[PDB]
Design an enzyme around this catalytic site. Sequence first.
Site, short mmCIF file in Angstrom:
data_model
loop_
_atom_site.label_atom_id
_atom_site.label_comp_id
_atom_site.label_asym_id
_atom_site.label_seq_id
_atom_site.Cartn_x
_atom_site.Cartn_y
_atom_site.Cartn_z
N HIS A 1 0.60 -1.24 0.10
CA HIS A 1 -0.05 -0.11 -0.27
C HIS A 1 0.79 1.23 -0.07
CE1 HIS A 1 -3.69 1.97 1.58
NE2 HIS A 1 -2.85 3.11 1.51
N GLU A 2 1.76 0.82 0.50
CA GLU A 2 2.52 2.84 1.00
C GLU A 2 3.49 3.13 -0.55
OE1 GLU A 2 2.21 4.18 2.85
OE2 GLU A 2 0.96 3.07 4.85
N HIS B 1 1.33 4.27 -3.23
CA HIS B 1 1.22 5.63 -2.97
C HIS B 1 2.79 6.08 -3.89
CE1 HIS B 1 -1.90 6.47 -0.71
NE2 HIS B 1 -1.16 6.21 0.66
N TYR C 1 -4.18 14.09 -2.67
CA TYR C 1 -5.06 13.59 -1.61
C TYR C 1 -5.76 14.33 -0.95
CZ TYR C 1 -3.81 9.26 1.36
OH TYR C 1 -3.88 8.67 2.70
N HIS D 1 -9.94 7.84 3.61
CA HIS D 1 -10.05 6.04 4.00
C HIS D 1 -10.99 5.87 4.49
CE1 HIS D 1 -5.81 7.96 5.38
NE2 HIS D 1 -5.24 6.51 4.53
ZN ZN Z 1 -2.55 5.57 2.11
#
Ligand code: ZN
Length: 316
Positions: free
Chosen positions: A142-143, A146, A157, A231
């Site tokens: 996931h990171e 990004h 974002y 999120h």
């Molecule tokens: Zn994230």
Amino acid sequence: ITGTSTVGVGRGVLGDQKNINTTYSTYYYLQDNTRGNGIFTYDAKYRTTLPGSLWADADNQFFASYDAPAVDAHYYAGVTYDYYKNVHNRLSYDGNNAAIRSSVHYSQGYNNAFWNGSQMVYGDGDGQTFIPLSGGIDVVAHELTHAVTDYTAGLIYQNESGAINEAISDIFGTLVEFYANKNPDWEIGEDVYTPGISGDSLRSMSDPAKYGDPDHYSKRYTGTQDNGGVHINSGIINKAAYLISQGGTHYGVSVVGIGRDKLGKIFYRALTQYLTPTSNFSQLRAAAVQSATDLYGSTSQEVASVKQAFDAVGVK
Ligand SMILES: [Zn+2]
Ligand SMILES: COC(=O)[C@@H](N)Cc1ccccc1
Ligand SMILES: [Ca+2]
Ligand SMILES: [Ca+2]
Ligand SMILES: [Ca+2]
Ligand SMILES: [Ca+2]
């Protein structure tokens, strides 16, 4: 650093033993020269200065408790690199084998992880809400995703473009977890969340409502918390992705699944060819429809399933 490539061994956050690519020059460093221009893992030493110091070890054995978050950040960065190269022909996050750098032991009791524009960063958790967050392969991927988004679509974002940014990271974090084929699921963070509670996770893609997140556009969060719900409203896109892959009937709309590999191909093409910094959900639908058309044909089942999936979550 300059040195010779070696292979160490250690134990990750969950107690599993794995081999790791290291570099020897007086010490053994968490520096993997076999992938791109290198994968580098650093000790932030419970402080917030970044990156900290390149991880050095006297004997190339990484079995101390303090070592475990570093082992996993380093190893899972390698797996994620392998996924992007082998599955999508992408060389690191910039497509040009950029060095991948991660810091662990960030701050004290820090219940998060993040990409800071230049590197990945992992807290150790407080021991109750989280254990060290690099223990989750879906978290690590996931990171690093990004970073991939930063260099491709550049989704801002906040609000809908930020929820897409989040969903892209959850999607590819999950596809990396399946690629590695160790207890894969459609949940996010289950390997590091709440050590005293079995069976839960931070988010669900298959049923986002399980943790309160929306699974239909009519249920989207419209306030200002969480950068406008990045999120939270990710659940709408995560559900659509889950339906594209696995199928299902959702709010009375039936979706024929096409499988994970085709999900990955369609959303990777959308991300790298069609999405822009300000893309909203309706534009994401158009981008996915065009990607599926590109890959499989306008009359394909794949295109039909993309449309049904977004119909099912209320995105026109
Ligand atoms: Zn994230
Ligand atoms: C060249 O000497 C140096 O750089 C010294 N800092 C000693 C040292 C060498 C290698 C690794 C760690 C420490
Ligand atoms: Ca050691
Ligand atoms: Ca899992
Ligand atoms: Ca998972
Ligand atoms: Ca748990």
